[PDB]
Design a protein around this ligand. Structure first.
Ligand code: HEM
Ligand code: HEM
Ligand SMILES: Cc1cc(N)nc(CCc2cc(F)cc(CC[C@@H]3CCCN3)c2)c1
Ligand SMILES: Cc1cc(N)nc(CCc2cc(F)cc(CC[C@@H]3CCCN3)c2)c1
Ligand SMILES: C[C@H](O)[C@H](O)[C@H]1CNc2nc(N)[nH]c(=O)c2N1
Ligand SMILES: C[C@H](O)[C@H](O)[C@H]1CNc2nc(N)[nH]c(=O)c2N1
Ligand SMILES: [Zn+2]
Lengths: 410, 414
């Protein structure tokens, strides 16, 4: 049945019909909502209807549903699943599938850009060296000297589960984290375990606060191999503040390119376990979560100190004030270095415009309020006031197990 | 449905196990295929047959809570209730049950961050009320008790339950204390834009409006399904706080103030299948309710622009974050003003920390704690509060507070 969503600030009401096309589970039931749970919980027989569904919607998108080309594609695919227990996507299908996995990503506030995605087909890759070459090309292309461009690189699909392609890095570019003797942590605390795996694998750590991690790449189920991304390919931004002259002295920097490399791309029942994708940052991703999460860089105290704020009571809101200044700094630094970045006001504004576009042309837009609303100043952004329906459309990006839990070494 | 559900805190890695969800009752609005977790709201009167098991379930729960389950007094209460539903199509709660039920409706309110306080609720039994004048008396006493000269105390006043649906008690006000809002001929709004409709109802009903920026609305009170009647709350019972800033001397020049007592009066209390359509309850504010929503929502008092001007902020680019900057200062002022006037208020850091402690205790002692993340996380600085990182399960337990239709939409005028 048709569902309505209201914006409580503008009184705009949209009608969702698109949800009628979803299949696999949200995690919720009529009795229990799991909207804030981060991760809720093939064969020839399972494969064809999934392939059929996908081919059907592809040919429906290019206005040739039921065509001879459509009819023959279905036959070709069925015949191929028959003999090889799988099938291969056409290039046009791969590109359509990747764009729509982004289009369907309910947790992404950046989806107004969804159809401008550069798709790199790396399905001919066979070795970690080949993966490294492809990933370098991606990074170089996507960075584009600061004028960032959205991109995805797609490695060979899963076959028997024993020969998976995986990027072991959760993101292509991240800073190392080190467990110090005294008990504290140097670098990025989120990456302490992964940093230790790289060290355990032969990586010589500079033990700095912003050491770019090496790539750990697994091809065709083999042991992963270490690679250093060439430093000229890694664009970084020193963080400074437009008024606080002392801010530069904090010694902070971040990288310009956000590139998720641990997710799984599902298209027509096919599983692409290595599909690193990248866009550009929303300022709060760095300024709020990376720098101010207690379990991350945790710099609020220091900043509030230099701001000489009253830090004895919570109700002075010293944390909130230091937080805003940090996020001003990040946006100012990127903009000053002409590195693409978006603030949470502009991004959420664009997302409301996108939703309206999608309801008009597509009959809806799956969206996860819990992730869409920014981690600071929530209700002064327009998505706070926007009701959203969340549901799962395919093609899609999914979570998968960390490779160091599933991999049986040499 | 699975016996155990786990929730993780992603900052602390603490994992909690929920069994309480097995007792969930009505719908969330969600399905296997769609989640409605961000949807704000996702005559008929229970029949004899619908009422029996709802009453039994509640009575069983009550007698379990007092460690007398299966006792003689328990079986006798069951029998008395059953006969009463049989002979009168309804039944009456004992005072003990009424108090237990109200406290648990609060305990079960998944959208409430203040529930660590739930067992400390003063319950006022107004089921002997017959007239709007009497409702007025009960509500004034509630307000005065709850206000306690600034040392606020949580309270609920419970008016007679629904009978046939044609004799409902209702407070027409959505909250006991709100400021009027006036639409002007040029399209601008004076006062609180949120209350323009209700304000015009009051004016039609005979209220003489002072037409100012902070006019306390009168009470519009309906007893026994009769037409509602207007009453002015004695102004000495309405504690207010002028808003000033500990640093910006000019902040007081904005002429802002707010009332001390948040008191919701449009919700329905369900206990044992009985429906209490008039049950105003009150607590104390979290600062952001005022500083972020009331003052800074664009469709509310919307003062961000004027605060930013007096702060001399660059307001031409959003990326200067001038809005965020002014928002923080406004919320510093609100907390500073309440604390200085010794009126109870809690900041969002303290409230959410207490809520996590509460939720952990509930998981351990009760087997769970329904919580609505979308409502629990504060409207500013979300991720620097501990609830942001906390996975939650949302489900409906009874006794409960529920939404109900606005009374002007359903009332049959006499
Ligand atoms: C182009 C600019 C983009 C912006 C500004 C943007 C913004 C964001 C933000 C702020 C998040 C939340 C991330 C987090 O909290 O960890 C997110 C999530 C996500 N984005 Fe986008 N994004 C962009 C591009 C892309 C692209 C190119 C793709 C894929 C082709 C994509 C797919 C996703 C997915 C699948 C998630 C959810 C990830 C998860 O569940 O952990 N995004 N995006
Ligand atoms: C004692 C201090 C209390 C605090 C600090 C507190 C805090 C809050 C806050 C911040 C909200 C969100 C309100 C909004 O955004 O409109 C809320 C909602 C709610 N509170 Fe509490 N509260 C308190 C007392 C109470 C009491 C005494 C009751 C009932 C007996 C109660 C029941 C509820 C309910 C049912 C909601 C959901 C309201 C809705 O859906 O509109 N609270 N509370
Ligand atoms: C494509 C893209 C664009 C954009 N602006 N941001 C992203 C996310 C980038 C990112 C970059 C990064 F370094 C780390 C993470 C992980 C965040 C954790 C893991 C899951 C829950 N939270 C994510 C991707
Ligand atoms: C008991 C209680 C304590 C507390 N701190 N806050 C509350 C809520 C008080 C309140 C006070 C108020 F003035 C308005 C509201 C509801 C505002 C909007 C209208 C539609 C959805 N929400 C709520 C109650
Ligand atoms: C659309 C969304 O559900 C709506 O704006 C909600 C979000 N969370 C909220 N949270 C609280 N505490 N109060 C609210 O009024 C709202 N509004
Ligand atoms: C428990 C909760 O689901 C978790 O902290 C979520 C909340 N919302 C989020 N939103 C975004 N964009 N990113 C996140 O990592 C999270 N974390
Ligand atoms: Zn749900």
């Amino acid at each position: 049945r048709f569902l309505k969503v209201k914006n409580w600030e503008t009184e705009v009401v949209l009608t969702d019909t698109l949800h009628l096309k979803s299949t696999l589970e949200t995690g919720c039931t009529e009795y229990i909502c799991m909207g804030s749970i981060m991760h809720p919980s093939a064969t020839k027989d399972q494969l064809f209807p999934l392939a059929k569904e996908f081919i059907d919607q592809y040919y429906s998108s290019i206005k040739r549903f039921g065509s001879k080309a459509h009819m023959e594609r279905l036959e070709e695919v069925n015949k191929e699943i028959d003999t090889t227990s799988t099938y291969q996507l056409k290039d046009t299908e791969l590109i359509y599938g990747a764009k729509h996995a982004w289009r369907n990503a309910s947790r992404c506030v950046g989806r107004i850009q969804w159809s401008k995605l550069q798709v790199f087909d790396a399905r001919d890759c066979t070795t970690a060296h080949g993966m490294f070459n492809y990933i370098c090309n991606h990074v170089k292309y996507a960075t584009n000297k600061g004028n960032l461009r959205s991109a995805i690189t797609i490695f060979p699909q899963r076959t028997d589960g024993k020969h998976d392609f995986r990027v072991w890095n959760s993101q292509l570019i991240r800073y190392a984290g080190y467990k110090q003797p005294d008990g504290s942590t140097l670098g990025d605390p989120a990456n302490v375990q992964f940093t230790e795996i790289c060290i355990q694998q032969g990586w010589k750590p500079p033990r700095g606060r912003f050491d770019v991690l090496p790539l750990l790449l697994q091809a065709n189920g083999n042991d992963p191999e270490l690679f250093q991304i060439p430093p000229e390919l890694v664009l970084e931004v020193p963080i400074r503040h437009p008024k606080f002259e002392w801010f530069k002295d904090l010694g902070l920097k971040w990288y310009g390119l956000p590139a998720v490399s641990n997710m799984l791309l599902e298209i027509g029942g096919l599983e692409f376990s290595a599909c690193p994708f990248s866009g550009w940052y929303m300022g709060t991703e760095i300024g709020v979560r990376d720098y101010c999460d207690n379990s991350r860089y945790n710099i609020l105290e220091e900043v509030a100190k230099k701001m000489n704020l009253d830090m004895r009571k919570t109700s002075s809101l010293w944390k909130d004030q230091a937080l805003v200044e940090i996020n001003i700094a990040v946006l100012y630094s990127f903009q000053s270095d002409k590195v693409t970045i978006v603030d949470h006001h502009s991004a959420t504004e664009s997302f409301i415009k996108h939703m309206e576009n999608e309801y008009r042309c597509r009959g809806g837009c799956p969206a996860d309020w819990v992730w869409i609303v920014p981690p600071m100043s929530g209700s002064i952004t327009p998505v706070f006031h926007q009701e959203m329906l969340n549901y799962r459309l395919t093609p899609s990006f999914e979570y998968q197990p960390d490779p160091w839990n599933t991999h049986v070494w040499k």
